[PDB]
Design a binder for this molecule. Structure first.
Ligand SMILES: *[C@@H]1O[C@H](CO)[C@@H](O[C@@H]2O[C@H](CO)[C@@H](O[C@@H]3O[C@H](CO)[C@@H](O)[C@H](O)[C@@H]3O)[C@H](O)[C@H]2NC(C)=O)[C@H](O)[C@H]1NC(C)=O
Ligand SMILES: *[C@@H]1O[C@H](CO)[C@@H](O[C@@H]2O[C@H](CO)[C@@H](O[C@@H]3O[C@H](CO)[C@@H](O)[C@H](O)[C@@H]3O)[C@H](O)[C@H]2NC(C)=O)[C@H](O)[C@H]1NC(C)=O
Ligand SMILES: *[C@@H]1O[C@H](CO)[C@@H](O[C@@H]2O[C@H](CO)[C@@H](O[C@@H]3O[C@H](CO)[C@@H](O)[C@H](O)[C@@H]3O)[C@H](O)[C@H]2NC(C)=O)[C@H](O)[C@H]1NC(C)=O
Ligand SMILES: *[C@@H]1O[C@H](CO)[C@@H](O)[C@H](O)[C@H]1NC(C)=O
Ligand SMILES: *[C@@H]1O[C@H](CO)[C@@H](O)[C@H](O)[C@H]1NC(C)=O
Ligand SMILES: *[C@@H]1O[C@H](CO)[C@@H](O)[C@H](O)[C@H]1NC(C)=O
Ligand SMILES: *[C@@H]1O[C@H](CO)[C@@H](O)[C@H](O)[C@H]1NC(C)=O
Lengths: 872, 78
């Protein structure tokens, strides 16, 4: 039919018809036989995939004839017409090299039974002329010849060792000279571990963390920073465990990776949700988003899922990786400039990334493809440490000549040679995923001077090293406009409302942190003496009436606070939403994806303003369709009209040669023009409509290690096996599962199931057998929890919060009035005998929520005469 | 690979390559040149077949080569 049909059935190309990647039933005669007729799928003409010329291969005991035969070496020049071209006789090479007139070669001509050939001395590459030998640049061409640095020599190479590395007498090897002995540092799900390099000693640096996926040390101060994604905090601690604190706790929707700078004394971390790389001092005083949007200057590569970081202060470049649709390993200068891509080919899931400071080689690991590669810092010559046999590596660090990587599927730490991946040794296996890894050693952070030097190089807030490891650029916090003065910079204090500005202008804290019982500003202007007593708890907005409302509800186009300052004109004037939150006319904030989502999500309905959606300028990396909705570029030219209108599917271009599935990962489905990835194949889901992904799962194989095969021919990671979840529908994963051993901070139920140690007497019977909730009076409790009189544990934060989390309500009745005025309820709420601050609307509201909050207010509302009482 | 008299396995390409590839130099040792073409030596019953070193013989079908490597004796196929 026509192009307006916008639908196609199963073509089922059989003999002559051959549906290409764009599903075009072109003739079978077009297979490179002078016929590039199918420009649509482009499969009819292939530059090298269709040009093979595979004649030359034949057994070495056979001399290939010029006619194409493979006359035997014994039959070579056997005085018999063995071939049509008679290459055996026609070709009888006699002392061609001995003849000086012909076969003149550079180093060493080697004769044969037919014609001649030549060989070059070691370190000299033979030229295409087959007579000229050219010296090999072993330092760049084959960097694995030398450990650490190298110098090119004519016909050979000289290896050296960086300072601190003692060169071994054997040569081409280096050995450390530091006083300290290096030991691996990696983070489990709840534990920071301490493992020696040889794997002889195992330890536990710190436990009791929700979910740690990243860590990085600081040689200067002997600190150890990490990220708790579940808790959304960036915390640091001394190696001796003397002090622990939360550096950053605000605006961390998801922090995949972290990299501590040990030169400019800065902290960098990637944010997957906000899609940007941030910078802050080791105390988190000043924050600034350094990079955002796309990185290729063409919008092909953009921050989608950045989960790797590696600092090289010697050149001031911070390499990072992204496992989105368009995987890239691009780098940025530490000052936030020179944003550029490095490696963008043969890459699906670059989870891990590191920089070998010894020889300046950028190492990265791919999860789906399963390889580990190293290249120059400009990403020119890619060499594979491993072919891809690794099931699913996540983190990678290099020390001396050994590369240490942590693999999720095998749930273990493995090490090998940094160049050829030899001596692959499994150090220790962990019950949980191994996550980020590092090698703690003074050499891992080489000493290099700070261009800032002092006073942040005379910068007001931030001093970031310029690219190339020379000079610095002044910066400003996120809430400051960076003006470039004459030979200097000025940070405009321009800040939105609902955000206090310190008198010293050090930072722009939120308004609800002004006079919050804490001197948030270093000056302390926020906690002015002349300020009303704030009865509301920290992290809450206090209205003039004294009621407490959530800061998220501030200026939410709804008069939540009775006093009215919630929607006050001055407080909502110049209100700015989050970076990913698209502001509406009524100042209500909605996610940027909802800007023209075709849904009246915002009360003012500005999210469906035709005028603004027609004139909607969209961030790079997302495709704009007719409706004005901006789906991601990966959602453009897909079989599914994600935008709804077929404008998101330029079927002319979608069937054209522009959209061809990547050979490495993107698997083309024959019936449509879909380009689902390789790991999307046989995922048990109809990822592409024709179900071609799920057709060959019986023929499809699994990874030899770190993969479990189910009865449905489903390959799943070995870690997912016996996880208590049916990863494969046939329950083969959970068919036979001996209970696993519980870790240090895991309590073992009588059901032989491991639960977090914090959940004993959780007051929610998390374990099925309810064995966790026993002996609570004899259990004391954890240091960070308050114990109810009944004996159960509760968060110390939830104490005296107006919420009786304890059943006996002891968590609230053991504290005085929330304010010295003489009452417990700040927002005119109802306080029962248990001192629970039942909301004023919730006062005498249907069921008796409070333990002793039974109300005789039948006059206001008799219990029997209640709508809530659906069932007598 | 052509097995050397010393026990090596000098390559066929290296056979008679004018190089001392083996201790016995079997490659350069008595390079087989038209030994079958010479009627004085390599006299075989049916068909002498030359090689890069010395010679050998082949018999017509139905005739088994004798231990002498020069006499072909009819096979008793029955
Ligand atoms: C992680 O584990 C490693 C290995 O246990 C720890 O490094 C070790 O630290 C101890 C205590 O400082 C060192 O003992 C020292 O021995 C020397 C003599 O060899 C002695 O002069 C010192 O006074 C001290 O007793 C041990 O040698 C050292 N080993 C290594 C591998 O360097 C590391 O401190 C642990 N880190 C954390 C944060 O848990
Ligand atoms: C655990 O290890 C860390 C890192 O080595 C220790 O932090 C640093 O410890 C040193 C020695 O106590 C501190 O030096 C002292 O500084 C004060 C001034 O702040 C000075 O008056 C003292 O004479 C001495 O020079 C250093 O300040 C401290 N870190 C920083 C940068 O503040 C930590 O103390 C160790 N904890 C223990 C006791 O295991
Ligand atoms: C900003 O980043 C870009 C991209 O990384 C830098 O450009 C790069 O500069 C290096 C050093 O000159 C180049 O390496 C050289 O490449 C050539 C082959 O092109 C090779 O023969 C040399 O031995 C060396 O490896 C690299 O190719 C080049 N890359 C690109 C894409 O331009 C730039 O220098 C950085 N500095 C700035 C301008 O901020
Ligand atoms: C190459 O030729 C030189 C000069 O004749 C000689 O010294 C050297 O041993 C030869 N090497 C090889 C590989 O034959
Ligand atoms: C990059 O940008 C150019 C225009 O400057 C465009 O023609 C091209 O298609 C874009 N994609 C590539 C090849 O990176
Ligand atoms: C680690 O691997 C070894 C060798 O397969 C095995 O004996 C040991 O039980 C494993 N440990 C864990 C915790 O799975
Ligand atoms: C063997 O020798 C006979 C007699 O000269 C000749 O007719 C025949 O063609 C030869 N066959 C071979 C395989 O040389």
């Amino acid at each position: 039919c026509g192009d307006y049909s916008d639908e196609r059935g199963c073509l089922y190309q059989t003999c002559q018809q051959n549906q290409f990647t764009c599903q075009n039933g072109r003739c079978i005669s077009k297979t490179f036989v002078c016929d590039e007729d199918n420009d649509c799928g482009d499969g009819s003409d292939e530059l090298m995939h269709l040009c093979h010329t595979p004649e030359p291969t034949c057994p070495p005991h056979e001399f290939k004839c010029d006619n194409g035969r493979c006359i035997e070496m014994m039959k070579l020049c056997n005085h018999l017409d063995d071939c049509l071209d008679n290459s055996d006789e026609k070709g009888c090479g006699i002392n061609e090299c001995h003849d000086p007139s012909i076969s003149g070669c550079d180093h060493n001509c080697t004769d044969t039974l037919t014609s001649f050939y030549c060989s070059c001395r070691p370190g000299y590459k033979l030229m295409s002329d087959k007579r000229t030998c050219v010296d090999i640049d072993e330092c760049t061409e084959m960097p694995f010849v030398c450990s650490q640095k190298c110098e090119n020599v004519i016909g050979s190479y000289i290896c050296k060792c960086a300072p601190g590395y003692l060169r071994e007498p054997d040569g081409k090897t280096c050995r450390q000279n530091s006083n300290i002995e290096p030991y691996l540092i990696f983070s489990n799900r709840y534990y920071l571990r301490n493992l020696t390099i040889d794997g002889y000693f195992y330890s536990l640096i710190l436990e009791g963390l929700d979910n740690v996926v990243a860590l990085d040390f600081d040689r200067v101060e002997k600190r150890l920073y990490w990220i708790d994604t579940q808790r959304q905090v960036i915390e640091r601690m001394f190696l001796n465990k003397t002090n622990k604190e939360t550096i950053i706790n605000h605006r961390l929707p998801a922090a995949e990776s972290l990299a501590v700078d040990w030169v400019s004394r800065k902290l960098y971390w990637l944010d997957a949700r906000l899609d940007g790389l941030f910078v802050s001092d080791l105390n988190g005083g000043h924050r600034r988003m350094l990079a955002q949007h796309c990185v290729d200057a063409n919008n092909t590569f953009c921050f989608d899922n950045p989960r790797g970081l590696a600092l090289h202060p010697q050149y001031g470049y911070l390499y990072w990786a992204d496992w989105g649709h368009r995987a890239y390993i691009g780098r940025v200068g530490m000052d936030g400039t020179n944003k550029s891509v490095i490696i963008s080919t043969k890459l699906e899931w670059p989870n891990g990334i590191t920089i070998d400071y010894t020889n300046d080689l950028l190492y990265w690991a791919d999860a789906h493809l399963g390889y580990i590669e190293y290249s120059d810092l400009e990403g020119h010559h890619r060499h594979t440490v491993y072919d891809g046999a690794l099931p699913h590596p996540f983190a990678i660090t290099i020390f001396e000549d050994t590369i240490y990587w942590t693999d999720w599927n095998t749930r273990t730490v493995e090490k090998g040679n940094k160049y050829d991946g030899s001596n692959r040794q499994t150090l220790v296996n962990t019950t949980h995923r191994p996550f980020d890894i590092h090698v703690y050693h003074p050499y891992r952070q080489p000493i290099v001077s700070n261009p800032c030097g002092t006073n942040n190089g005379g910068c007001s807030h931030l001093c970031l090293i310029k690219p190339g490891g020379k000079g610095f650029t002044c910066e400003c916090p996120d809430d400051f406009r960076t003006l470039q003065l004459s030979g200097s910079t000025y940070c405009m204090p321009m800040c939105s409302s609902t955000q206090f500005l310190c008198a010293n202008n050090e930072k722009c804290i939120p308004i609800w942190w002004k006079c919050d019982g804490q001197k948030d500003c270093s000056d302390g202007s926020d906690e002015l003496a002349l300020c009303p007593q704030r009865f509301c708890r920290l992290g809450q907005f206090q209205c003039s009436d004294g009621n407490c409302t959530s800061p998220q509800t501030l200026c939410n186009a709804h008069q939540n606070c009775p006093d009215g300052s919630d929607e006050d004109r001055l407080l909502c004037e110049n209100h700015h939403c989050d970076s990913n939150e698209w502001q509406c006319a009524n100042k209500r904030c909605i996610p940027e994806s909802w800007q023209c989502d075709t849904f009246n999500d915002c009360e003012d309905n500005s999210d469906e303003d035709s005028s603004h959606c027609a004139s909607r300028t969209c961030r790079p990396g997302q495709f704009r369709c007719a409706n004005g909705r901006c789906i991601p570029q990966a959602w453009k030219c897909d079989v599914d009209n994600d935008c709804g209108d077929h404008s998101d599917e330029p079927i002319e271009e979608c069937m054209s040669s522009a959209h061809l599935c990547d050979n490495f990962t993107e698997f083309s489905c024959k019936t449509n023009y879909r380009c689902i990835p390789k790991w999307a194949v046989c995922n048990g889901v109809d990822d592409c409509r024709d179900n071609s992904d799920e057709q060959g799962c019986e023929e499809r194989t699994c990874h030899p290690v770190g993969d479990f095969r189910c009865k449905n021919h489903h390959c799943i990671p070995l870690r997912w096996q016996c996880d208590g979840q049916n990863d494969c529908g046939d329950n083969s994963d959970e068919e036979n599962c001996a209970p696993r051993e519980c870790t240090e901070s895991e309590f073992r139920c009588v059901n032989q199931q491991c639960i977090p140690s914090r959940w004993i007497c959780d007051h929610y019977n998390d374990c099925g057998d309810n064995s966790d909730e026993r002996d609570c009076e004899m259990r004391t409790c954890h240091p960070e929890y308050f114990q109810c009189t009944s004996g159960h544990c509760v968060h110390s934060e939830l104490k005296c919060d107006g919420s009786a989390d304890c059943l006996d309500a002891s968590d609230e009745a053991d504290c005085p009035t929330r304010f010295p005025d003489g009452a417990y309820c700040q927002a005119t709420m109802f306080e029962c005998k248990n001192h629970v601050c039942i909301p004023p609307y919730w006062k005498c509201d249907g069921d008796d929520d409070c333990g002793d909050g039974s109300d005789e207010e039948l006059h206001l509302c008799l219990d029997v005469p209640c709508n809530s009482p659906n069932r007598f």
